[model samples]
Target: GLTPQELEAYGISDVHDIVYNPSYDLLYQEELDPSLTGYERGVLTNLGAVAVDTGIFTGRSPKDKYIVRDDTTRDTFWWADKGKGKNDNKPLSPETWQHLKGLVTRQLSGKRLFVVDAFCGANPDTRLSVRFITEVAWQAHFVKNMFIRPSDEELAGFKPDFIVMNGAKCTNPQWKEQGLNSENFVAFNLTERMQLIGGTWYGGEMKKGMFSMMNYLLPLKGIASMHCSANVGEKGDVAVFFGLSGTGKTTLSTDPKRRLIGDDEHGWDDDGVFNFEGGCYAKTIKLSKEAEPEIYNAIRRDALLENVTVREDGTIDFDDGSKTENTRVSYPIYHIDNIVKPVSKAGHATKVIFLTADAFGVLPPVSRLTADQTQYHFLSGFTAKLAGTERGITEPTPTFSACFGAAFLSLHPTQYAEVLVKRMQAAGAQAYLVNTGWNGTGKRISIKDTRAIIDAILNGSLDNAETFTLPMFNLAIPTELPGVDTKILDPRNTYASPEQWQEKAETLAKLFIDNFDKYTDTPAGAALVAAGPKL
Candidate 1:
């Protein structure tokens, strides 16, 4: 199928003349059909055993590996070798644990797996989905595989078909200075001699503890998942893109005629929703290859450098400083141009976006929520923080994290608001709250008016008859549009400088009334603490 000078000598420029399926050997004989069904031969034998185990480990070793802190001096090892018992700590072999369990079982064959014990080191701050919902009362569990170590025990146990924990340094006597704990019987804490910890200390909290243990094990395997940013449109339009971390959720859910299946976790099984990040963290401090040219040409040279700063003859320097702002890079969602790879599932979800970043600038750049108002703003995971003062004055203020992830969740935000209100009430799926910040009435509202209201909510021309509402926060103000003239239920035209918009709405209404006054003396349930100042 490659002729146009052998597809231009294999570089394949934007594919135009490549079409094979002459029933490619009858789809490889119905993928070696053993008389089909069991869901069509388990979807062609787990997509031909994950494409022959990801082409038998392309380029081999180092998708990521590090465990610094032996009093730190970061010596990136490719093969260091030692610690079986003489202590210069080692472990990473058995052919690097069979190539990281065949790169997480070939990118989790037939999808639906989640596991995150991210650097609580040993029971650090204990949240393990509040002891897996007081030991499985069912929030849809099937974590498949995950084994993170270091614990002192605030108790988050697991036999591991799935597990997640975050008791943050459980009385750090250092798990008796590393002999290991929870009464050792080592199966997967990767044989524990310690030191693998990198989600880069708090605020990427180990990539939000492996993205909330893979979005709480993808809805107990019913799949149909959401915590958005998916892409797959060569005209099929599977676009997802919900937001947080500088909205645009990986720049308008990366769509160059689709094909990018993940940019931030995705899952929706029973055959539809799969994409558990194999990279593309993007958000390089004010980055913009002409407003996100495929995440600015996907950073390049196999990107992964977090908290970017660069310079001394290297180059980057995006500039907010404290040694270059909270950047977070990573790349390889097929180094972007519209990607959508690792697939064994994903079928429903037509569209669902939430993304706020409303720095007191009172709402409405795009609206439509009601499935109990998109489960009350997906349990209010709202966003907004400016961060500038050399990257640290009151650490860039404007905050809200009821579920936009309380600094890398380990669970108990009502176990991801009861699996996002039972997967948007069993997939009738359609929720948009878009904003990406600011609409009018002064000081803010210009990254060219939030990219012309995100290109009129991604070319649908701002709420084209989807029926919109929510813009009266109790004052019933709706001057609609025209260059910001205030009154869409006013949060100071959603902040851009009415004196830092009433100092970020009195510091985001006193950080949501001091995290709802520490769960108003906990025993939980005042409808889960009056589901936090709704709106």
Candidate 2:
């Protein structure tokens, strides 16, 4: 199977036929047989997933996403964040990033190529031998149902520490030819570890272009990458969630008596939490099987569903949104029947939950953070962009996504909040702040009150139950639980007037101090600015 002159010694050339590691019934028989230039794509529902339709994108273009300011990221990339209104992480020079990598390597070497050879952490000591190189056979079967699946003698000696180069049917057609703003692009080049992308067939731009290269090479190997979701318990403890995209972190870490270990991105390090993709890209709008039965039976047949809307009896109207309410599904995290199997070996995290949807509902659905208020709400990544979901105001809108993955960050949200304040204070871990948002009478907090405040912080019943200290978002709140209703644990008793709930909790504490006055106070988050909101 190593023909075409053995991929011309890896510099790629005139592709034509490569196909390696291709089975999922040969990509559902080439997406239900068609394309010999007939392009019979999209809509394959009845649970065997496969919906796609991403024209003009279905989320994530991240300001045309570029990064290739070489000299190895020019003095360690973090472009303009001092006055804090600049980092969209864009920069592409190195002779136009090697002439757009020889024009997406001669546009996928003139077609028909599909390689997979995966691995993106399942912690075989921080795994990441990636390599996708697609031309879109449902994007090499959506990274072959999303990463980590080598065998057949690990794909007969696979090799590639990194190399995406998708070139979705390549198209540059002069975006004024190269300073590019759109016609679609996705650069990334960490000293030639490559990623190219281009145009957009949107398989989440090849799964967040390797989660922006593991949020920039796992923080120089001390590893703290996260945009998290994880679980495990039945004595193995460990819990991590942290959110920001609709803030639920895969519906509060999918716990049916916990054991999931990974539902979104992760990486922690110093020998503990791992999973940085072995799959589970969830979020399928209004999705249900009685409120997410493990991502509704993980949508079957090696899932890959995107842009939902299949109804001629094939069913799957996950509330069709014409093509974007960001419906998704990317399977293969052990098709979640309660996983945790070497989900890249995890264990050092006895608990930590940040999940905030607080569309200005004046917080406090739960809180118990202190290590400098967990590095000041992990660099004030408070949430709330829910006001008709985009294009501004009429009701609620406040967001600060610094460490809560301010768009797949590449470090400097205080360097992953100083590695989450030294790994949750060296694993005595207990941090919390679960305001799954909504309460100033605009009331909406229910998912069984965020699963009984994460079952009183994973059953020990909120350790010594009663907790107070909340002089306006200073948080510590936790007043008794077990089937909640401790009078909605003081969001000013669901306000209507405590002087309009102290002016909507001091206007959501001045939008977390003007969204943390964009923290690049140069030296670092001033050791957690007196743990935010306390005036």
Candidate 3:
């Protein structure tokens, strides 16, 4: 092992003792020279300081260290002592660390970048990783090193072009100082701070939080922004889908004819908006190939599974109620042909559709919303929350989260709503609410009906191109369909095997009314409630 003086000469100082793993094969020194660039070497020095101060490598036998091979890829690591469990340390050797640093430096140099999933454990959801790799990297030229917990000074020094905070725990203080209120940053315990030069920010909430951060940072950075599930379309229509999870946010947006811009999270720059995530996080519960062909096909050996229940034979247990109903499955975006690759400019969003699993049964399957109504609903950020066991619950409970993401935002819902309204209007984009829920008035709807409605929506049959009004609801539904029965707005008429429509409809309406009532008590809720009777 090198002495302290000799290590200092190599710019690796501050550690108390040299803790080398002789049992693990040493990395070839030849691989070290090019990999250990100036930036990497600097990061190594900083890490060494931390290791020594924290005593992270002390009192461990040489045999405790082992080389763990990554079965997923070619990556290999020299991990520290972890008795009777998965390799705990998973520490990259000096040579590998240098190589990684060089790659990161090259990817992020002089670019407006943000790390979406900085620290949510090693196995992060695909949405977070994809957003980091595609959106953050494409937006910025140079990115700073990924620190486990970055200091305020360190965060402010990196001078990030944009920072995305996600998944609980705001570690960086700079975000709070930069006008991001605590209330705006919900699920605050589940996020990390995005450290940039001018300011730091946090992200953990869903729609509202994500958009709020984007609005705040985009203008500050003099960049354009959009809040849609964007992907590059094949023909003229760069179709963008607006929906929360389980409402086909991933499934509907990925069309074979259209090149995917992104499944979730995107940024609109001067050149064009690009996708933030490099992967797709799809719903796996009762997922059908006939319905969601692409997502169904993507669920294979390579895909990442979250909270899915399997059968005794290793088949997916779709009917099992043991696990949370909302299954999260992730795969690389490259798996889908519709996904947008790296782009240079913010593409103009021509069409915008607000997706809703409206259990209320009051809303038409499809309707053009007025600009004011759009603004109101956008501000409401209303989306039903499918309860997960991780939050200490078993059954799925319906609740509303403002801005479709009350869990992760750094500003009030109104802040992001105002920005979305202005941008949509300015871009001359059309807005429509597509109900992926029940049809009928009070209690006459079923899942089949809901699926049919979704099918009509995807095929553009329920659009405004054909007729003005739908028969059953007497609502002026868009007639974008060509030959389908425009009059069969009720689920009983649409479904081949009609179920108990009235009971289902009533149950759905009750859920909506109950959920809506909960929000009506708050200041923001009161405003929406007041408009409810009028709408």
Candidate 4:
């Protein structure tokens, strides 16, 4: 335990008491007991894991997230419409930041705090020693599971590169005067190398707060920071899967035959690829043993389940998302049966996959990507939300998340696009767009068939296969894949009428082109735009 005087060096003062980096065994016990950790904490499940509920916020609130718009970020970051648009990088004035920090610090002084010091990046060369001062013990456990833990010797005199003050219980009642939308806020002060999260207990916010930091810092060092998953085959062939949430980045990367380097957030440097975090934050709604045995098997003791419902029998009802559709589980990477040793680095990628869930059924199930088209699609990050996936999305709705992770990106989309194209060329990596969404027949693509498609991609069977040009998106669709119906490969064939397919395809193409209009001034933007659909 450290006194408030000793913690003053870290910019935190007037705390009741501080528990620094408790062991996992101790954390589990702390979370299990209601006395030491009060209510709204977790309860131990029959499976030996902790089941907790995140009240009100079951997912990351991108609207409340912001970067302090100071001299450091004013010229560097991609501020949306000069701080008007609904884009993720909302700009908060430094004045508001200081005032909010002062208020939150005052709020923290009234309560005991739990702290965890850990590393953010797995690649030692670009790693950051992050200190997370959380107000709750389970949230401390969340950081412990998600971030890389340092060794005892490494902790002797750890000086954190950055500090995160997460006062989840603290709220800004003066949000109206502070010019904030809500009482909650997730602000990052890059100049100060500190992050502040208040008024929200969603655990995902903590993980993504650091991810947003990585998205900002890594590109400055010439490394391509990615919101994707990486896994290697038995023969050392690495495949990267890029997609937004609900698009299967975690599910696909946790392959039975491949060793997972990471489930999310990775970096591609000159030598090879490296994971940014040591753990995985996987979506758990409708999780099943037959479909995702690896993730299902990993949900045991030490894994933290969020927003999931437990049955009266003491077992979990994974299918029930009445609390929220974004049910999640966080565990250390080693929890998975097959993973890369050191859980940090892997060889250069041999295959790159951009996964999308096109509920409109206009895109093909699998399509090969040319260099320019790869950049085009990467920048577009096109996907769709099925009915009931989110609020008010009663039917399939089109979504274009820039770089598949617009919420976390700090730089212009083209910056990442240029680096991505350069790296793909350097490695000669084959890029493919695989849609795990609805085909024209209106049926969702099954995981079994998707796995077979991935198998063909990994085993080199699809390399020599004949491809047909899909005119709508100018995408090259493979003619055949093992265990997959050939008709689904060319999505138009699944539609009953050519007119119906053409109308939907053109609608999707128009959406992509319109979404990309903002990036028209990018270098080589003309060629990238031409690589997409014409008309």
Candidate 5:
């Protein structure tokens, strides 16, 4: 703990007092067991995990996001001028940054803040020392779950490489007058190594803010930062799974048979891949024990459940999303029984799997991808947004997020793809496209079947299997697998007629070609375009 007098050195002064890196138990008691005020009260579920509501802002607001547009970031950022995703990196001038910083510091000056000091990377060589000064106790607890904690000895001499001043309860009411979009904002300044989160209490902002920081910094150091889940087999063979949300990146990578390396973010460097986080932030909407046993059982003590329903009897109703559909839980990765020990780092991946929930139903359940195809599909990052997930999204909508997570990416998508290609080729990593989507028969691929396909990939059985090329996409599909039915192996077999299958295949192939047009001007883009399906 630090006194207000001592806190002045860090430009934070006149606070009531500071609680420096309080233990989980201490924070639980502070916010959940019984807070000092009713406004801060959070309930403990019957499963013993703490539960809290994030007001109306239950999810991330991408439009409200901003980055300091200074000399350091002017030419580097994938700005709107670059023809990248428009809403991704909004520009905020230095004057506005200083003004907002003043407003946040002034708003939080009198309150007793919770201070958390942690590291961002699991590997010692590339990890970042981060300090979080937050206005709420739960957000402080979230830092502990999500970030790597230092030992008592390390804490004695800890110095932060970056700082996050989270005024979770603060809002900019005069947004129109201030020339801002809304009261909510998640903004970062690379030169200052500072981030500010106001209005929105979504814990994801804190987690992703760190990711965006790493995505920017690590790449400059010649490391490949990825938005994927990784695990290692018994023989030390590592496998990486890449996908957007709802594509089962988390569920598929959390294999009961393999040792989990990390869930969400990771970096591949000379030391292979290391987890960016110490915990898992898994979605809990309709989470079931049978479907996701590891995650379902992980919702226990020491976990922080967000925006979930705590019924009258204190039991959790995972299906109830009245509060928000983006229900989530955060817990240390150690909660899982099967994780890499000593350090969450692994050797170079031997198998790289890109997962897509292809609601279009033309892609094979699994297809062997060449190096060119790997680079192409990775940059293309094709997935589908299913109906009923959002308003007016009545059917499967094609979604492309460059490098799997475009919003968090700091550089152009090609830079990341180039790194991935180099690492994969050097390691001789075999790449595959696994579609966890619907078959043409209107039936989605079962988890059981997907697991079989993954097992076949990891066990090396699929390597010797007979393969044939599909027409439109030229995807290499295995003709047989030990456990998986042969009928579903070829997507065209699932259709009633060859002509009907051709129609859908041509349509999906055209979408791929069309999406890759923006990248056609790059040096490697020509090879990548040729690697796609024949349209």
Candidate 6:
């Protein structure tokens, strides 16, 4: 360890006093040190997994997120904001970027830091070399588990294509001076390939900051980067699941039969689907051993457990929503024995599933989607806002998040749509809308029936089954699915009043159309727009 003044005298500028390259064991020792008070560090279970708490910021702050409006990103960035669901890219200048960097620099000077270098993409051709310079040791560990770890040989010559300097404990007291909306700031400078974050220790900033970068970079490279979970079947067929958190992206993709590719973040190209993350960040609020045995068992040594409430005897109450339902646990991809190796895998999707916990209950249990219809629904990324997911939510509220990842996207949703439109159609893959939601009542769809629907889709039994079109939305409702109750296939059949069900369907269709009115032009096509309910 060296002094900042001495480092400054030596003319080192960027991260002059970095505590660079400490081993995970050394970092663990420092986590127990007295200086860093923000962390609630401990080993929660018999498995040596490390657990920590992130106070104030239990979840991500999309409203406070911004991208610097410099020469490189201004012309291309899509600056649309959809209130709570979608986050907008507000502008920041290069000058303010320099100032923020300086503040972070001062915060790290003479301060102990934990640095980790990892790759973002699994494919060698598209791999992004990333270096994370953080003030917290746990964050260093977090990145180590999240990003692609280099081998001993690869680590020797590591150089970063991008850097994330995170000062999680520091804050901008007068953010107004910089024309920022909040004191807690998370800003990115694309041209410089550097992101500066302060005021929040929400570990997701580092994960998503890199993702926001890829959202800008990968699209430019002719690849579609998405927020989805991936898994491959025994016969080598792949399935990609898309939805926001609490929508079973984690649970469904962690199928015991299928080899898990990843639980979140994937990129698709001409070759096959590749996972962006090296680990799975799974929601653990209601996690049960019987429900998700892999995820339940994956938490152990080196896994970072965040915001989970623990009992006096160290039993974690995953069912307790006292702190927040956004409780999470991230472990290396290899933790699950049935997963594909080291990230990159060769296989195209035989099926693309859009999972939604539809609180409105207007959608069917499972409905086949036409290509044009897929485009419309993909843009109108619909899901429910479950209780305890956010601050004020007491009941399940319906929400629309464009492309299922509108908040993290830098480009327009339409731009990403074109990529999916071409790739899925060209590959001759089928898409389906799986309602993991409820009926008119507040009950949730049973997991057993959900698995049956999934099994039928893969087994080809649903292919020859009869198809009936609903006059209301023109949806291709399957007359039968193996093992699933035929009555539940049509949501209207579950309701007490047929007339009330029809009215609710019309209202939901109007909701889709009204929300989709924002995207009337740019070749969504007449067929896609007309695919909504007959409103």
- Worst lDDT run of 10 residues, candidate 3, spans 46-55
Error of 4 at 67 (Å): 0.9
What's the true lDDT of residue 325 in model 1?
45
Q: In model 5, where do residues sit more than 4 Å from their true spots? A: 1-11, 33-39, 84-87, 177-179, 385-397, 496-498
- Candidate rank order under lDDT: 5, 4, 6, 2, 1, 3
Which is better, 3 or 4, measured by lDDT? 4
Sliding window of 10 residues with minimal summed lDDT for model 2: 386-395
Q: Is candidate 3 or candidate 6 better by lDDT?
A: 6
Candidate 4 weakest ten by summed lDDT: 386-395
Q: Which consecutive 10 residues in model 6 have the weakest lDDT in total?
A: 3-12
Q: Write the per-residue lDDT of candidate 3 for residues 317-378, one digit (tens) a residue.
A: 54444545555554555556545544311366656667666554445556665565565455
lDDT of 4 at 170: 81
- What lDDT tens digits, residue by residue, belong to model 5 across residues 1-535? 4457755655665887788989988887887645345335689889989888877767676777889989889988777545734437888889888777776777678888888889999887788899888878888988899998889888888878888888766777777786787887788888888888888787888888889888887887778999999999999999999876667778887889999999889999986988999899888888999889988888888899998899989999999877767778999888888899887889998899999888778999999987788888998888875442322344566777788787688788888887888788888899999999888876888988999999999998876678999887888899898798988989888876757788988888888888888888867697678899887
lDDT of 1 by residue, 365-449 (tens): 5565545455555555666644421123234345555555443332334555566556555665666666666544534445545
What is the Cα-based lDDT of residue 439 in candidate 3? Answer: 50
TM-scores for all candidates?
A: 0.26, 0.35, 0.53, 0.96, 0.94, 0.93
What is the C-alpha local distance difference test score of each model? Answer: 0.40, 0.74, 0.40, 0.83, 0.83, 0.77
C-alpha RMSD values across all candidates? 22.9, 19.8, 16.1, 2.0, 2.3, 3.0
Ranking by TM-score: 4, 5, 6, 3, 2, 1
Query: After superposition, which runs of candidate 4 have C-alpha atoms over 4 Å from their true positions?
Result: 1-3, 36-39, 83-86, 385-397
lDDT of 4 at 154: 72
lDDT of 4 by residue, 1-535 (tens): 3457855765566676778888889888878776744335787777778988877777677778878888888898888656322367888888999877876677667567888889988877788899888767789889999999988777876778888888777888889987787899988898888888888888888888888888888887788889999999999989999987788788889888899999889888898888888789889989998888899888888899987899777799899867777788999889887999965678889899999999888888899988788888998989865433333444556688778877778888777877777777899899999998888878888888888899899998876678999986888888888889887788888887867889998888888888887777646776678988877
- What global local distance difference test value does model 2 have? 0.74
Q: Could you tell me the TM-score of candidate 1?
A: 0.26
What residue runs in model 6 are displaced by over 4 Å at the alpha carbon? 1-22, 32-36, 81-86, 387-395, 525-527
